[PDB]
Amino acid sequence: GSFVEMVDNLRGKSGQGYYVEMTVGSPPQTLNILVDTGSSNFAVGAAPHPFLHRYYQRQLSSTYRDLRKGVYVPYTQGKWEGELGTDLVSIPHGPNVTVRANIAAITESDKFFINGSNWEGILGLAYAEIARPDDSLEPFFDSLVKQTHVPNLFSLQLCGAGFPLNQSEVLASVGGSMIIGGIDHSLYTGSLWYTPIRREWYYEVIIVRVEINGQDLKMDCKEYNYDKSIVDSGTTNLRLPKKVFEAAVKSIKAASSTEKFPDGFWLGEQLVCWQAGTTPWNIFPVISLYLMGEVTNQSFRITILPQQYLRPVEDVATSQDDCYKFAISQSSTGTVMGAVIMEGFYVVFDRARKRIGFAVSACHVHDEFRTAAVEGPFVTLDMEDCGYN
Numbered sequence: 001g002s003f004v005e006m007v008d009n010l011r012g013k014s015g016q017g018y019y020v021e022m023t024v025g026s027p028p029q030t031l032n033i034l035v036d037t038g039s040s041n042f043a044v045g046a047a048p049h050p051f052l053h054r055y056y057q058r059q060l061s062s063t064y065r066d067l068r069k070g071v072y073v074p075y076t077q078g079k080w081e082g083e084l085g086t087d088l089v090s091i092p093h094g095p096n097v098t099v100r101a102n103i104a105a106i107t108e109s110d111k112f113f114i115n116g117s118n119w120e121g122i123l124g125l126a127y128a129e130i131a132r133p134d135d136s137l138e139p140f141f142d143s144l145v146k147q148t149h150v151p152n153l154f155s156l157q158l159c160g161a162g163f164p165l166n167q168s169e170v171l172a173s174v175g176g177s178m179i180i181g182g183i184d185h186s187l188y189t190g191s192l193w194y195t196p197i198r199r200e201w202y203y204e205v206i207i208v209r210v211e212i213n214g215q216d217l218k219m220d221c222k223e224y225n226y227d228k229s230i231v232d233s234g235t236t237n238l239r240l241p242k243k244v245f246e247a248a249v250k251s252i253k254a255a256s257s258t259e260k261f262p263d264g265f266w267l268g269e270q271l272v273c274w275q276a277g278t279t280p281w282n283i284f285p286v287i288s289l290y291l292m293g294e295v296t297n298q299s300f301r302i303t304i305l306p307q308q309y310l311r312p313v314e315d316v317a318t319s320q321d322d323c324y325k326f327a328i329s330q331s332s333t334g335t336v337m338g339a340v341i342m343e344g345f346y347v348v349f350d351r352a353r354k355r356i357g358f359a360v361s362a363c364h365v366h367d368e369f370r371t372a373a374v375e376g377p378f379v380t381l382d383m384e385d386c387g388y389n
């Protein structure tokens, strides 16, 4: 309920990523690690790279163990190859422990590291099932729970600023919190509502209904989880299956039709700008995702605002304009509840009880007329049928 030691231990932002400080090896080598609930490999740059200010030097760690085995990991965008081994790992602003964990030493990569992101590795927090080479490589959190008394769960509060941040600003500000082993009540308001983790591979959940300003998209619910629906702190946008994306964009365009935007905007590629302070938030609809509840035939809903799905970006011109990119895009691999969703809520990854909790975030961006919300319950039947097989 109270872990002041870990509150505000994250830095970063959408687009580039949210990261936590970790140390690896002996003596401790400090590295910034991206928090990624969408994968299960712990990996770190281990050789010079144009975008890396530092990297893992195995030859300088007295505790480094070479597993003599290579590993390859591809992501929706980006990929890397590395060499497997183990070493001692600690988290300065996390529990006071030291765990021996598997570490992939990245030796080659493509479209993975991000210039200026300030992170040098990735912490895959999902399950062994999707770890590479296979489920035999124990993920970091599994090691943590097995080697310590830290409870089997963590929570994330990702904080979007609501406006663009320059390099010095992102470096000097709080990007959020990752509470390891517990929940901190100062990070949310209202109550926590839980949805079942369908299966332990990605953090998969089941969406049972979608609304645009209260109006039902009215699609066969399997379409919403077509292939799957996951919660991923390593993805910026709310990504939706092709059919759902098209239906959603049609409805969002209709609700905001008093103003017309170019196709490039809806494709998530180009920005739309308004005179400083005049963004017409009210013309854009709220989006509600209903999730299966823990009680039979019960569901709840999470609702985000345009302040969540319109991502702030700096306008090239020295203009004092407020510009944004549409942060909802299509996916051919299922729904991805990325930062667009996570910046609106405090998310509890309760692995012990196989469930994910959502509560309104104490740091979500909004205005005087609307706020993000988590509400329930709703009598919903045959939710099990919403899952895709």
Ligand SMILES: Cc1cc(C)n(COC(=O)N[C@@H](CS(C)(=O)=O)C(=O)N[C@@H](CC(C)C)[C@@H](O)C[C@@H](C)C(=O)N[C@H](C(=O)NCC(C)C)C(C)C)n1
Residues within 6 Å of the ligand: 013, 014, 015, 016, 017, 018, 034, 036, 037, 038, 039, 040, 073, 074, 075, 076, 077, 078, 079, 112, 122, 130, 131, 132, 232, 233, 234, 235, 236, 237, 239, 339
């Ligand atoms: C917040 C935040 C953090 C970061 C780094 N961004 C910017 O990058 C992305 O949003 N990257 C997405 C691609 S996009 C722009 O939606 O199309 C992405 O691929 N994120 C991955 C992490 C980054 C650091 C490479 C991962 O979070 C996505 C996840 C679904 C994934 O690809 N998992 C892998 C996977 O499923 N691989 C199989 C196929 C897709 C190669 C694992 C299981 C091996 N936004």
